[PDB]
């Protein structure tokens with residue numbers, strides 16, 4: 001589409017050579033700054049070489065500006081169950097004289113338990129004593145050694161993805177297109193490197209917007225059913241039992257199994273209960289829908305309306321009413337990149353065909369320009385009031401661009417030049433005025449609002465008071481005279497009617 | 510729905526095994542406890558509770574006193590029974606709006 005906010009920060013900053021025989025370049029390095037733009041615009045970065053007449057540009061596309069948070073840590077919390085078993089034996093020797101562990105023996109496995117498995121998981125090797133008598137199983141009124149082992153299992157295999165975060169910094173999406181032809185997308189952060197791709201390190205800056213009631217919130221998501229919910233989650237390994245933050249593990253594939261070497265649990269997560277050689281285990285782990293302040297996918301806590309935006313690397317968003325933030329300018333840094341230049345530009349000449357759009361407003365005024373040349377794309381339009389750059393194709397085609405004007409009757413003479421050749425163009429048409437749209441029920445904001453032009457807010461005597469009757473060349477005086485005569489006639493008629501009414505009301509009472 | 514409670518802050522479900530007698534009274538916590546209320550010498554399990562020997566029984570300190578005048582070394586009792594602490598209810602309990610039955 002169209003483009004605006006040119007920079008031209010590091011023009012003529014190359015140290016190339018003949019260029020592989022005919023014309024080539026090596027690298028261009030510098031630093032520039034891109035101001036804030038409305039959602040659905042393009043910021044072009046036009047380079048200039050001392051030898052070549054013109055060069056290509058670098059367009060920056062922004063679609064949505066959502067309120068997301070950073071990624072402090074990532075883990076998976078699987079669901080667990082209650083599994084336990086025991087065994088009843090007799091002393092029958094000197095191994096169980098008084099107690100089972102003499103001083104510190106915790107290995108309560110006599111090469112018989114099922115703990116030596118890959119699906120067993122985490123547990124605690126506990127033990128207790130027994131009783132004596134014919135009903136207790138032995139022939140000695142003395143405590144008998146009775147071992148017990150408990151663990152946790154996961155038959156279903158439901159996997160959860162929790163990511164604690166407490167920053168909630170503004171962010172947006174960027175659809176960057178390299179001058180070579182490659183088009184990729186990435187999500188920049190407010191101060192975090194965005195995985196620089198071939199030198200370009202364009203980052204986004206915010207305004208540090210405060211939150212109303214966002215203190216302990218996370219972005220726990222489900223994988224199988226793709227269900228999202230907002231609930232306060234735990235912190236890193238050093239945690240407390242009582243809320244979310246139960247037995248975790250290393251990775252996602254290691255979450256189906258609760259085995260050791262990757263799974264982390266502090267203490268007191270499964271209880272043991274036994275009366276007479278039973279060793280029954282009760283469940284104490286709370287599910288995700290058990291803590292307080294458990295929200296759902298649609299959340300309207302405070303002024304923010306947290307929706308579920310389909311996007312990679314993040315599924316949490318939200319957009320309040322029109323905010324009109326202060327600034328959202330970017331910062332672009334270069335490290336290394338190549339760009340080929342033709343420097344074989346020939347005669348090119350275009351003209352204006354149509355013109356339409358709003359007044360000085362958000363969408364602006366779109367103007368269609370038709371060109372014809374042999375070169376692929378060598379053009380740079382420059383005029384007063386606004387500057388717009390775009391790309392063309394080989395042959396004769398039609399293109400639509402948008403410019404910013406500050407006058408209803410657009411009748412000027414702009415200069416158009418493609419590559420090295422220059423010409424003159426003219427624009428003539430009628431424009432209209434559109435204000436900021438109003439809010440309607442049933443509609444919710446999706447990403448954000450950038451800015452609305454509400455500066456003048458005053459009627460202009462030039463545009464107004466004209467289209468009611470017309471406009472010739474020197475008939476304005478006659479029109480004013482006719483307006484005055486009609487006004488005087490209507491005044492006399494109204495006065496006569498009022499006098500007749502007063503005369504009728506006074507007499508004949 | 511996470512229903513709140515009126516006066517249920519420190520309550521337990523201590524039960525008796527022989528006579529099957531139930532009562533509601535504030536009990537202690539895990540091994541790290543304080544002497545003065547319920548929470549006397551415990552052990553591992555019920556079948557191991559008949560004996561007060563080591564390897565399962567846990568006591569912190571100061572649960573039995575010693576007194577001697579002339580080669581006597583007499584011992585006095587300080588352990589309190591279950592019916593000695595305050596707020597000791599019975600099977601029928603009507604504390605607040607809740608009527609705790611069995």
Ligand SMILES: *[C@@H]1O[C@H](CO)[C@@H](O)[C@H](O)[C@H]1NC(C)=O
Nearest residue numbers: 213215216232243291292293
């Ligand atoms: C739930 O939110 C309320 C209000 O923000 C807060 O007072 C309360 O402590 C929260 N609950 C938990 C368990 O954090």
Ligand SMILES: *[C@@H]1O[C@H](CO)[C@@H](O)[C@H](O)[C@H]1NC(C)=O
Nearest residue numbers: 353354355356368370398399
């Ligand atoms: C220019 O003429 C009218 C004016 O609005 C427009 O509808 C038309 O599509 C334009 N011509 C071309 C070839 O696009």
Ligand SMILES: *[C@@H]1O[C@H](CO)[C@@H](O)[C@H](O)[C@H]1NC(C)=O
Nearest residue numbers: 340341342375376377393394
């Ligand atoms: C111009 O574009 C055509 C098709 O897009 C391509 O085949 C050709 O190589 C391009 N020429 C230059 C000089 O980029």
Ligand SMILES: *[C@@H]1O[C@H](CO)[C@@H](O)[C@H](O)[C@H]1NC(C)=O
Nearest residue numbers: 516518519535546594595596
């Ligand atoms: C008994 O209950 C009352 C009222 O809840 C309380 O003030 C008092 O401290 C309790 N006594 C003990 C020993 O906990």
